[PDB]
Amino acid sequence: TALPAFNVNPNSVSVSGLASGGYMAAQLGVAYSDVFNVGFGVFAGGPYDCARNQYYTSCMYNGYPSITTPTANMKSWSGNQIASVANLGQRKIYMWTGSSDTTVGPNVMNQLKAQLGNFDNSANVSYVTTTGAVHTFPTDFNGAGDNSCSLSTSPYISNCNYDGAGAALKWIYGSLNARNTGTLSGSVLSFAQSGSYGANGMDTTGYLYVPQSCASGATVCSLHVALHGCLQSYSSIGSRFIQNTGYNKWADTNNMIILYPQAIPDYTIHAIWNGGVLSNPNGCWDWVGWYGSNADQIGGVQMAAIVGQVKQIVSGFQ
Numbered sequence: 596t597a598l599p600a601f602n603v604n605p606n607s608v609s610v611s612g613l614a615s616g617g618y619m620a621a622q623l624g625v626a627y628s629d630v631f632n633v634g635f636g637v638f639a640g641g642p643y644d645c646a647r648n649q650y651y652t653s654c655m656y657n658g659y660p661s662i663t664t665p666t667a668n669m670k671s672w673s674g675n676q677i678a679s680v681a682n683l684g685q686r687k688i689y690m691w692t693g694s695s696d697t698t699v700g701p702n703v704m705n706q707l708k709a710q711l712g713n714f715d716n717s718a719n720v721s722y723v724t725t726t727g728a729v730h731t732f733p734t735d736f737n738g739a740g741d742n743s744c745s746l747s748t749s750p751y752i753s754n755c756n757y758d759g760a761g762a763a764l765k766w767i768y769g770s771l772n773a774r775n776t777g778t779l780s781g782s783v784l785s786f787a788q789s790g791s792y793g794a795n796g797m798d799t800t801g802y803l804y805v806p807q808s809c810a811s812g813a814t815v816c817s818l819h820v821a822l823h824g825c826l827q828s829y830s831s832i833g834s835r836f837i838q839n840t841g842y843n844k845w846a847d848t849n850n851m852i853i854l855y856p857q858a859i860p861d862y863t864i865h866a867i868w869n870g871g872v873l874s875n876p877n878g879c880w881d882w883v884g885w886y887g888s889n890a891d892q893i894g895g896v897q898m899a900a901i902v903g904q905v906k907q908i909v910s911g912f913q
């Protein structure tokens with residue numbers, strides 16, 4: 596199936612994600628700040644360009660990664676390898692961490708906050724910590740097969756007594772109509788992540804939730820891109836990220852399409868930015884340089900694929 600064009604305003608696009616998907620969300624929010632022009636959200640991710648000049652595990656396990664060079668790179672690349680960082684001064688930025696997360700962690704997420712603080716507007720930043728939550732996607736309902744919010748294990752989606760999807764979307768878009776807590780009006784569509792929509796480390800197929808109101812094109816809709824983390828691709832947990840995270844509940848009543856690009860496990864070994872080589876058996880988004888030296892810059896193969904998907908969807912704006 597081909598990815599459809601919808602009546603989506605190009606000025607209403609944003610992105611969020613968990614963990615490696617949170618890292619990627621920030622990579623998109625920075626490198627393509629012009630495309631993701633409303634803002635972005637990061638759940639338990641870390642600094643833009645964190646892993647380029649220090650080993651990636653230093654950007655994990657609740658350590659204190661350096662952001663001296665990453666921040667310098669943002670300044671240096673502005674307007675060339677990434678969109679002008681001036682854009683970040685007019686973006687809504689949502690950030691979340693569990694206080695008990697020792698996989699990425701408060702100390703890592705705080706460095707992302709500090710890094711973006713060089714470029715953003717504090718009034719338009721929301722940084723939230725959920726006490727007791729580990730490395731997992733925070734929701735406020737018992738999604739099928741959810742792990743405990745106090746134990747980090749597959750599918751890494753939990754009832755943390757906190758509606759993370761709603762918090763992120765409401766922060767990014769401002770007011771929203773109450774979420775739909777019952778039968779959704781729309782459908783989850785599948786499309787081929789092929790050609791310009793695809794990249795190494797990405798699955799053959801992606802998904803998007805389209806509310807009934809966005810189907811005809813009679814109504815202008817917005818677009819949020821939601822990125823799963825490692826071990827959360829469709830290959831790993833089927834439709835559980837798409838359904839259990841709670842984005843669609845909010846989208847359904849707010850003329851919003853949610854795009855869910857899909858990574859795929861890749862057992863092959865790749866040279867990465869520093870520290871030698873690494874495989875991607877968990878199907879993570881590329882924040883370490885698996886698929887090229889420009890993973891977090893314009894032209895990064897995965898970011899380019901996601902942006903290509905976005906460009907197609909908004910090309911139907913009337």
Ligand SMILES: *[C@@H]1O[C@H](CO)[C@@H](O)[C@H](O)[C@H]1NC(C)=O
Pocket residue numbers: 684685686687716719768769
């Ligand atoms: C803050 O975000 C709002 C969107 O809600 C935007 O209109 C405004 O320009 C931003 N504020 C500043 C001064 O950047």
